[PDB]
Structures are given as C-alpha cells and as structure tokens.
Paper text:
In this context, phosphoribosylpyrophosphate (PRPP) is an essential molecule for the biosynthesis of purine and pyrimidine nucleotides, of NAD(P), as well as of the amino acids histidine and tryptophan. The M. tuberculosis PrsA (MtPrsA) catalyzes the Mg2+-dependent conversion of ribose 5-phosphate (R5P) to PRPP using ATP, and is the solely enzyme responsible for PRPP synthesis in MTB.
The final MsPrsA structure contains residues from Arg9 to Gly316, with no electron density observed for the first eight amino-acids and for the stretch Arg204-Lys213. A Matthews parameter and a solvent fraction of 2.11 Å Da-1 and 41.76%, respectively, were calculated indicating the presence of three protein subunits in the asymmetric unit. The resulting hexamer is endowed with a 32-point symmetry with a two-fold axis perpendicular to a three-fold axis and shows the subunits arranged in a propeller-shaped cyclic assembly with the N-terminal domains oriented toward the inner side of the hexamer, close to the three-fold axis. Each domain consists of an ɑ/β fold built on a central five-stranded parallel β-sheet surrounded by four ɑ-helices with the N-terminal domain (residues Thr139-Phe146) containing an additional 310 helix. In all the subunits of MsPrsA one molecule of acetate (ACT) sits in the phosphate binding pocket of the ribose-5-phosphate binding site and makes specific contacts with residues defining the R5P binding loop (amino-acids Asp230-Thr238). As the crystal structure we determined is the one of the ligand-free form, we analysed the R5P and ATP binding mode by modelling the ligands in their respective binding sites by optimal structural superposition and energy minimization.
Author numbering:
A (entry chain A), B (entry chain B), C (entry chain C), D (entry chain C), E (entry chain B), F (entry chain A): 10 to 204, 214 to 316
C-alpha cells in the first residue's frame, strides 16, 4: 500500500496544507494549458499500484478545473493506480440537484457520473448543498461536515452572548436546527419569502448567527442582515462553509452591518475577496483525517 | 419523427448557417452563466420524442463549451428525447489520442466516454486528427471530410499552376497523398524533422500546397513556408480544415511568404484572427447534408 | 546662411505643416518615377550654399522612399549645399538594431552608414525603437521625443481617472516607467510572456494606459487589451508615436475594447487607416522647433 | 577557400541557372517582407570565412531589390565573410551617370558608394550604360560584355544577308562600330535628331541590325524601325542586352516591322513580356565563368 | 433626298463607327496611290443627286489626306452631287490662324478657301484651335464640342475628388473656365510663361484637371504636370480632344506623373501612340448626330 | 519693279541653277515640318511690292510639295506681292486631265483652281501631258517645251544614224511627228495596243528614237524597247522630259537594251535613280529665260 496525493492548480495553498498534515509530498506533474484551453497533464513519477487521492478545488472558472480533475483521473486509471478517490471540497453544480420547473438537467448527477466514468472509486466532499447528492454516485461518498469546526469557533468567541440561529431561507432550516442544538439549544428563526420578506421568530435584542452553505454574490445574505437589523437584532454573525464570494460580495458584506463573516478555505480566498470582518478557518485537518481513514481502510 | 436542432453559444454564425440550410429553426433555450462559471441550461419548448442534433463548436475557452454540450445532452436525456446526436465540428482533445510514451491520459477517449455517459447515441465530427478516434465511441461516428471542399476551391483558382502537395510533418503524409490524387496526380513532398529540418522531394519553381488538419500557433506551418521558400518554391498556399489560430499565428502567417491561407469555419474566425491572405469557406452545407442523412435514414 | 527645406513625396501633409510653421516654402523639385522604378530627382532652383533639411517619411513601400531620400542628399552634396540634415520622423529598419542570435544584418546601422555616405551631416528622428540607435551615426543625431506631447494630452482628458501605465512586453518597461512618472507617479504593470501570457501588477478596476513605440498589425497590442480586460480593467487607452497601421490593424483596434487610440503623424494616416477611437496629434511643431534650433546653430 | 552563392528573390531562374553551371547550391536563407515593406534577411547556414557572391537582378520595383542586396552584404560583413562580390547583371541607375546640365544627382555613383559602404569588395556587371561606370567604384569592377554572345547568334542566322549596323541615337555609335567590326566590317548608320529625325548613312535594301544597350518602353526603338522602313530597309533586327520591356513595349515591338528582337536574361523575362519575334539568350554561362575566375583568383 | 457617306483612307475605324451609328454603308470607291504619290479616286456606285458627307481625318502625313479629301470633293462636284459637306474632325493647319507678327501665311484660311473651291458647301469640325476659324469659310460651319463628352467621363470617375481646372497656357483659359463651370463651379488656375514658368492660382493638395485642345509633342503639357507636382498637387489628369501624339509624347506622358490621359479618336490612335494611362473615347456618336441633323434639316 | 525668286525644298539643285543664271539670290525663308506633317513657312526679308516667282518641283511625296507651294503663294499674297507666278516644272496630276470611264475627278483642273485661289496670277510649266491643260487656268500659262533641247542633243550625237521616231503608245503620236520634223523629216512608227502589242511602221535595221513625256515605272517604255528589238531595230534611244523614275525603273531601263536614256532635270535625279546610260540635261537656262521675259513684261 502506497499513498499518493495529486493536486490540480486551482487551489495550491489547500494542497500544501493537506500535504503537510499527512507528511506526504504532492506528486510531481506537468500541468499546463494550450492556447486553445485544452489541458495537458503528465505525471513525473511512477503511479502504478498507488492509493491515489486527487485533490481539486473548483473556483471560477469552474469547468476548466472539473476537466483537469477528470483528465488526471483518466491518467491514473491508465497508469494502473489501484484505488482512486476524488476529493472535491466544493462540489461543482451542487445547486443543480433537481429539475425545478423542468426541461432542465440534473447537473450534480452528471458530475458524479462523469467522475465514475473517468475511473473514480470514491468521492470526498465537504458540506454538500443537499445530503442526497451522496446517493448520486454508485460507490462510497464521504460527506464531511464543517459544522463542528464553525460552531466550535462561534462557541469560543460568542458563548457570552444571547444567541438565535437564523436561516436566510426556507431550504436551510434543518441545518440551522442542527446548529442551534450544537450551540446549547438556543432559539431558531428564518426568513420567509413570499412569491416580500419577513422574519419568522424573535430576534429583538439578540445576537443572530446567520448560517448558510455558501456565500456567492452576497445578495440573499446581505438582504437578511438588513432585515434582522430592522427587526432589532443587537448583532449579526455570518457563517458559511464555502466562500465563493463572487463580484460585489466582498464590498456588499463589508458594508452590511455584520460583525463577523466566517468561512472555510474549501475555495481559495484571494486578496481581492478579503475584508476586515472576514475570518477563514482551515479545512485541511479535516481533509487530512478523512484521507488517512480511507487509506488505512480498517 | 421530429427533427430538433440545438446549439450552444460558442459559435452562433455556424448554427444559423446550418439552420438555414435545413430550413429549421434552432430550438429556444436559456443558456447563461452563474458568476461561479456554472452553466445553466433550460429548453423553452418541448423536446419529448425528438431526434435531437446538438451542435457545439469548441473554441477558447474550450472546457466550458464541452461542459455546456454535456449538460444539454443530460437535459435531452431527462426530457425523453428519442435519439441524441452530438455534433462537434472540431473534436476537443483530438491531439491527445495516445500516451506519447506515458504517464499521460488519453483525453480523446475520455471525451467520447463522457459524451456516451451524458446520453449521446452518435457523434458527428469533421477531419479528426486521426481516423482511429472513430473507434473511441461505442456507437456510430460519422467522420466528415472537408477535402472535396478545399481541393475544389484550390482547383478553381490554381488549376493553371504547377503544383506540389507538401506535408508539414511526417504524421500527415497520407492525407497529403489523398490531396495530390484529388488535384490530378501531382507530386508530393514533406518536411523531415530530426531530433534540423529538411524538405524531402523537389519543390523548386513549383506552387506548393501546404496541407494540415489544423493551424494552432502557426509555428510548424510558418517554419515550413520559410523552408520551402529557401528551396526555391515559386509560391506557397496553406490549406487546413480547422483555424484555431491562437496567439501570434495571425501575425505569423500574414508575415510569412504565403500567398493564401484557406480554412473552414468549424471554429469561429473572429476579427482578431483575420488577415488579408485568409479565406474562410463554410462547412455548413456539409453539416446540413450529414444531419439530413442521419435524420432521414439516408 | 540660408534655410532650405526639401521634401520627398511620401508624406506631403507633414511637409506642408512643417513648412507653414517655419514660414518657408518647400523647395521646387521634379521627383518622378521611370516605369522601371528608378527615381529621378532634379532641383528647380539654386541650392548652392544652403543649410538643407531633407524631410522624408517612410510608409509602405518603404525602400523606395529611403532611396529617394539618399538620392536627394547626393544631389545636394553635388550641388554645393553647405550643410545637410536628414529628417526621418519614423526611422526605417529601427526594429533590426541587433542580431537576435545571428546570422542577421544590423539594418538600422546600415541605414545610418548609407545616409553618411550619401552626404548627410546630421540625422533627426522621433522616438527611435531604441535610444542606442543615436550611436549608429558618426555625427549629431537629434532624438526627439513625443512623450510630453502624448502624456500632456492624456493628462488633459484622463486626469480624473485612476491610472496604471502598462507595457505590452518586457522590452518597453523602462519607457513605461518614464510615462508613469510624467502622469504623477502612478503604478506600473506589464505583460509577461513565457516561452502563456500573464499580467504582472494589479490593473483591476483601473484605467490602463497601454504604451508602445509603434503599432504595426495590431496583433500584440490587441492581445494585451484582451488580457487587461480579462484581469478586470475598467478602461484601456492605447498610445503610440508611430501609426504604421498596416493590414487589419484599423479593424482590429476598432473592435477591441479600447476607448481611445492616440498616435502622431510621423507616418501619413490615410483615410483607410482611420477609425472613430483614433486620435492623431501633429508632430509638426516639434519638427519645426528642432529645425529652427539646428539652423540657428547658437 | 569556400565558394558560396547567395541570391535575392528578384530573378530566381537566373540564380538557378548560374548555380547549375557552377555545381553549387544557392545558400539557404530566409528573405521576407514585413507589411511595412522592410526586408528581413537571415542566413540559415554558416557563412564565416567564405568567398561570397551575392547575385541580385533589379527589375521593377527596383529600389526594393537594391536594398535587399545591400542588406545581404551587411549581414555577410557581420557574419565574417572573407570576401564579398556583388553581382548586378543590370546595374541600377546606370542611366543617371552624369548631371545632364544640373541640378541632379549622379545616382550611378551613389549606387557604387552604397555597395562599398555595405561591405562589397568587388562589383560584377553586364553591359553598363557607359564604360566609365567602372571607375565609380573604389575597387575591382568586372565589366562583362554580351557583344560576342549577341553577334555570334546574329552571325549564325543572318550571315547570308547584306547587313548594316544602325545606332538608334548619337550616344551609341561607338558600340555600334564595334559590332560592325565583329560582323565582318559591314557599314554603319545612325539616327540623327535635330533639336525632326533623319537616317545618316545608306540602308536602302539592307538588313539593319539596330543595336541598343537596353529596351525600356520601346518608344525610341520603335521610332527607329519605322524610320528605317521609310528609308527602304529590307529587314530590321533589334538586339539589346537588357530587356526591361515595361508597359506597352511588348505590344509595340510585336507590331512594329521588326523580324527579330534579341535580348539576354539579365532581367527576368516574364510571360507577359514575351512575344513571337522575341529571342532570349542566357547570360548564365558568362556569369558562371566570371565567378569561377574571381574565385580561382589565379 | 439621299444620304451618302464617303470616307478617305486615313482613319478607317472612325468611318466604320460613324457608319454603324447612322445605319448606312460607306460608299464604295477605289482609292490608291501612283508611285509618284498622286492619288487616284473613283466612285464605284452612282453619286448623282446625293447629300454627300465626306469624312477625312488628318494624321501624319497630313498633306496627302488633305489632297485626298479635295480630290473626292472635286469628283462629287463633277458627278452632280446636290450638297457636299466636308467633315474634318481635326482641322488641318488650325494652329496657323494668324500671322504671329509677319511674314507668314494664314494657312487655316487657305484650307477653307481650297475646300470652297473644290466644291464644299459646308464644313463640320470638332474643337477648333480657335472659334474664329468658323468665319474663315463662306458658308455654314458646324463647330462641334467634345466638352460634354470629356467632362461627363471625368464627372463619373473623379466626382469624389477636390478638383481644380488648370490651363497649360494663357491661350486656353476661357475654355478651361467653361470646364470648371461644367464640373460644378470648381476653381481655376493656369501656367504663366514669361519670355520662367509659374502657376497662377492654388493647386496645393488638389486633383488637377489639365485641359488642352490637343496634345502634339507633349512638351508644354509635360512641363505643366511637373510644375503642378512641384506646387503640391495631389494628382493630375490630362484631358484633350485631339491626340496627335507625335514623337516622344507617349514616352513623355507615360513617364510624367499623370494618373490619366483622356483623348478622343478624332485622329487614329495607333498602337505606337498607346500607353497605360491613356483612355480613348469615341467621337462617333457626336459626328453621327451632327450628320443626321444636317441631313434631316434638324 | 523688283524680281524675287522663292523656292521650295523639293529640288534645291534646280533652284540654285536658275538663281545663278538670273544672278539673283533665292529669298531667305524658314521652311520646316511639324511632326504632324503641317508645313511652316516664313519669309526672312521683305516681299512687299515684288514680282515673285515661286519655284517648286513635285517629286515623291508629291502632295506635300504642292501644299508647300500653295502656302508660299498665300504668304506672298498677304505680304503684298505685286505679281505672283507659280513655276511647276513637272505639273502635278497632269495625267488626270479627263474623266476616262467616269465618276472621277479632273485633278489637273483642281490644281489650277487651287493655285488661282492661293493667289497665283500666272503658271509656268514644261511639257504638259496635254497642251489643253493650258486652258485650265484663268490667266496666262507659259507652256515651255524641251523639244529643241532634246532633239538638239540627239542631232549632235546621232546625225550619222538612220533614224525612225517611235511613239510608245497611240496618245503620243502627234508629238512624235513634231520630233521627226525637227530631226530632218525622218519616218515615224508607234506601238499599237489592242484591248497584244504590235509595231506599226518599219524599224528593221534603224536607230529608234523612243519618245515620251515622262518615264514613271518604266513598264511601258521597257516593253517598247523589247518589241522594237524583236522587230530588228539596230539601236534604241529613249528621250523624255520628265524623269520620275520610280521603283524598279532604273534597274528596268539599265537592263533593257537601250543605248541611251535622255531626260531633263525638271525633277531631281537622285543617285538611286542614276545608271550608266542615263544623261541629264539642264532645264535651268530655259526656265531663266522664261522668268526674264515675264519679268521684263515688254
């Protein structure tokens, strides 16, 4: 048994942090783009017989990084790797996990099928948009949660406060309920959208923990902060696993009232996306523990 | 039986030309990008029971357009399309059709597998880098040739000349041999590369038809023009199916001695890629005839 | 002392502008071509004892105009002109000022020798491709700069903007640095080419001043515009001294994103080379001042 | 000692003929134009230590080819060629070899100076407009004559005839006298122009050999044919070394009464300049012998 | 009433063109020369009672064609022609229309008297050197103008240009004034000769229409082109009714800078007089309309 | 009264001989041709009040010399000459003195009318083709005869011989009869042509004097010599006033049997027309006597 770690080019800090935790160097490779956009991949040491972990994050532009991961998995399959696990800290197309009105694809299911066809035996991901995505892949899917990590941090710094957990929309109330339990059985509230916006529950004078899976443009979340403010909240804290933080989100979030915005580094948080209220916690130790347990295999 | 033509956003002029030749409208759809880079696709009329032809060209950035095509195919499969044919005028990753002595992927094979998994029943392509790519897909693959189109044009305008067909490298000599036959049994030459460059055959005082499958950066082809020039060629004409024309190729080709450069519009030839010696012929009539024959059991 | 101004046929508007600033008529001469291409030159008034300034621009076809200037200088030398200054607003063959790793001519040095052999005592030029070309001639070389003229214009119209000076390649960074100083000590960036293209420096949200010595086909410069666009530039302004503007450059520049393209009239900017974003500033006042100072001779 | 033959692009057939006679390949080189008109030259094999012969003919457009020859000589000088001979079968600007009563250049003398400055050690030319041009260059000038070649041909085909040698103007009478001696001491006549035209000498019933150095537009020579016709000449034969043959000369000469027009191939005689009475003799054997003798150097 | 068209031998293409426009055949006749030079004329069908039009152009040698016309008129007078009109598209001896300060003939008047004595009742001519020649003949003289024809052609092809009409000498300014009016009221200039040459008026940057009644040797007109060129004219177009084009005029005009030379076919333009800038318009339709009106009492 | 002698350029020896006999210089004039063929005439001393004699011979090309004479007469008429006599030693168009079949001119009458219209008061000619031409001119016509001159010479050298006068055709028998009387009443013969040739009269063993007005091509006269030879003539002598001697006549007459050919110099007998049997007698003394008698005027 031989553990080998491979990494795409999208998020080099995460790869380096994971490699350090495991005490294993990232496997040498040439990874480059033709002017075309076609990706070229070549492994610069032997991969025959290894237990391979292929780590790729999927920031913008996302389709390029998804193809790079599939190409690496093809190469390991043709190079006689024994077992291939794909690690996708942010699962691409997770939001497209059903048809909605219809005549649509289920893109999250297509991603799992493509990873299977490329040669992946296992998928590891963090905080899927829905837990049912775990059933999209014909094989083991380790669905890691950042909840303990995020609530542990919030518990260390806001234990003194009078807390209410708030879900920014109706889809996320169940997870919010899990957080409220983790924070000592505090109350719960959420934003009801009629197709107007209303807060359902009492937040007056309370420290609100606004929890979401991801922050993309910051529209929904900034709207929620302003609503909670209007309803007499003392404080608002934003916590999410994935900081996609596109477009005006950094500016939007810095200018909204929130005291703190807490994210993990499943995606690379570049200097353009940073702002003073932003705190980034590392997902690396969680990823390293999962790789170790998969590799140890009992 | 109902013919429906779907098109991605990469090359709208080709889609419009094909639609005109068939006398059918392109099917209405919403195709847009989240800031993330994730593609959203929705069909705005019914697609149940149709014979679908999904046309997507693959210019830079290529991996985005490949995912868009796969997503459209997933949607047609879940929308109960009867038969799905993928049309890829320029086949992405065609150059990566073997390992080149390890440890590499066979990306051209991966593309065919991903198209199969998405739900494609047939692939149609024009002038594959190698003919053996036809065997990469478990199903019908119509491999269309632009040879008649390109040699017909050269025959109209250079019948008066004393011609030699020249292959810019050892890989393309067989196709070059076919062109020489089409042009009335004229002589043949090619550039031999030792790992220096040498012309093998007599070109002195002749009008050279330099033929390639594609022009990417123009490095190999410009080198060949200069070599033929040094060996006393009266003129040089460049003909290729695919104008990828990345980077300095336009400057490079315009500045090299070539009298004419002839390409098809399998890829969109934007105004940045244009130059005075450049001629673009339409591949649309050929694509329309192939679709009609596939559709009509012709 | 008697000032006489002679002009070739290549760029009559510049000659007329310079003549007007000096209040001196252009000296009468017969300048015509045999069918052969041989140039015939004859002066139609006396030139004995004059301080002669021979003005010739060098647009396409360039070698003809170079020979016309050499022939005029020979005639002035045999007609007993006292002092002969050659004015070459765009110095022909300036790009060929070194060997580029053999086996090449140094054509810029050949031009200076030929002008010396013909009888020229001085050379006047505007924004040489490299400053070292001044050492190629055994005698005075007045190297005039359009920098103040171009940055003055940019200062009047874009002072409100948040500027970065950008060099389109590694060769021009020093001149770009001079411009940044002229524009109030603004930041600096340049395009790095690995032998892929990358912008080095931050341009996100800034108004980019892309500076080059000349624009020929517009390939490199259009490429740089697109790269800056991709990196989140608000605006791009193109500024260059010499508008050679051959081939597709007018169409290429008009359809790239640039808000303005600023050149001088060292070369004639014909109506085929014009487009809406194009601004042409006159080099005539600068040339007239230099002639006056040379003529006044203290 | 190593003989190397370099050729410009103006007259490839002559270069190929000369190369064949010597049994030496033309040296490989890249010779191409920027859109500007600037010529780029590079030698593709070593030239260090060679005896170089740089062959360039000077058809329309002439100044371009003159610059190409100067540029090649500069490159050989900087590439450490041992000895450089310029071969100019038709000497450009030979007609401008004096002032013609002022204020004109002596362009033929300028050409020799420019060739010297570029690095030429020798000049080889064929039938200079005046023999004194040999003194314009500070160094060896081999002035080759086509007289034996042309009178040899006329002797084989018109020995039976009753011949008079006729000069089309007062400037060429001495050379005409040399021809009359070569043809067996036949009589002499010439066209006298008063500033009306008159033939001086008896041509009635005789076969006239009209001799000139070159034929350009064919105006003077066609005029002379008609004058000789009016004076009762049986036949007129035109013989000249250089067939410049611009404009209407081919049509003019074909429709004037002349039975034959004999030229050499010092200039390229393209298919547009051909007509039935035209005979072209090769100058190549003469050029190859001269190169060999210069190279052998005793 | 019976229309009969007779033609001399000088200009057969004009006679055929006129005959076609009228839909009449040229009357059969024997016209031949004794070795002496005496002309023999005989009509080979009846001419009694006809309205005769005797068409003769007067190229070199001119006195022969004048006698032929007089002889034909004598024969028609003795053959009982009812009315005889002489058509002389180029009026011979028109330049000798006054004594020029003695002791000279008035040859233009003599020509009219000789035509009257031979039996002519009318004279028709095109663009007489002076309009007063109309008074030299005791009878009707239809003086036709080619102005509309020449300015119509110039208007079609140079309407886009910024025009000035230029007279090559002081004698033609009035006609030049008429042309400027026809061309839309454009400015006027002319060449002043002191007995030096000077342009009077502004031509700088303008397209000059140099207009004359005839071009003979091309001396005056070539001089004018060079003068306009020296005064900064963008271009020069030459237009004249009569192309006499003797001697070196073709060489002279082709070598001067003029972009176009436009003439009519009042004289036969043989292949020796042709050159590339030369355009010939037919005077036949104008002649046919005049004959029809004279014949029809129109 | 003041005698002035003017001469055209056709026959300068005759003019000089006549001038010498009269002791009067030929009046100075400029007489030249434009390339056109138009003649320019100017008198270089005063002609007012003179008795003018305008001497012109009319060799080939004849119409030019006829126009020159008419132009000179016009000039004398406008220069106030008192009396103008035209001298035409050979009267042009004399052979066309009637219509023959018809639809012909009477060109001899047209010549007289043109001379009258030009301003001539008198015509002097030698040996008109028919004596009735004297009635074609409305005024004095001095018709001079060379008969005494020619028979006087024949009497000096052939008195010893047994003579018969022979007319070469039926038209000339009367003049031949006059000669026979002048030679002492010798017999007469002539050639009868049937429309075959026959001699009518006895010439056997006799010295034949073949007499004609002129010799043109020599066809008729050579035919007559051969016929007389066949009929047993001892000798044949040819005598004619006018030696036109065109074409092969010199060769024809030299090769026919004739012992002597006697002509006058009414036309210039150039060296091409000379042969050994040819004798030329001067008409000058006869012309000088006629001028003197006209001038003396009683």
């Amino acid at each position: 048994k031989n553990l080998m770690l491979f990494a795409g080019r999208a998020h080099p800090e995460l790869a380096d942090q994971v490699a350090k935790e495991l005490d294993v160097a990232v496997t040498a490779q040439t990874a480059r783009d033709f002017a075309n956009g076609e990706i070229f991949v070549r492994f610069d040491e032997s991969v025959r017989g290894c237990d391979a972990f292929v780590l790729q994050s999927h920031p913008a532009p996302l389709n390029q990084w998804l193809m790079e991961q599939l190409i690496m998995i093809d190469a390991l399959k043709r190079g006689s790797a024994k077992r291939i696990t794909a690690i996708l800290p942010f699962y691409p197309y997770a939001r497209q996990d059903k048809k909605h009105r219809g005549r649509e694809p289920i893109s999250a299911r297509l991603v799992a099928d493509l990873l299977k066809t490329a040669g992946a035996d296992r998928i590891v991901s963090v905080d899927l948009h829905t837990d049912q995505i775990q059933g999209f892949f014909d094989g083991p899917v380790d669905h890691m949660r950042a909840q303990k990590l995020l609530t542990g941090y919030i518990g260390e710094h806001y234990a003194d406060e009078d807390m209410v957990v708030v879900s920014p929309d109706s889809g996320r109330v169940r997870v919010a309920e899990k957080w409220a339990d983790s924070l000592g059985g505090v109350p719960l509230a959420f934003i009801h959208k009629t197709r107007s916006n209303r807060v359902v529950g009492d937040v007056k004078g309370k420290t609100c923990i606004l929890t979401d899976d991801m922050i993309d443009t910051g529209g929904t979340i900034a709207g929620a902060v302003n609503l909670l403010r209007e309803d007499g909240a003392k404080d608002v804290i934003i916590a999410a696993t994935h900081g996609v933080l596109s477009d005006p989100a950094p500016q939007r979030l810095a200018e909204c009232g929130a005291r703190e915005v807490i994210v993990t580094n499943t995606l690379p948080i570049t200097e353009d996306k940073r702002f003073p209220q932003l705190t980034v916690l590392s997902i690396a130790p969680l990823l390293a523990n999962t790789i170790r347990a998969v590799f140890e295999n009992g």
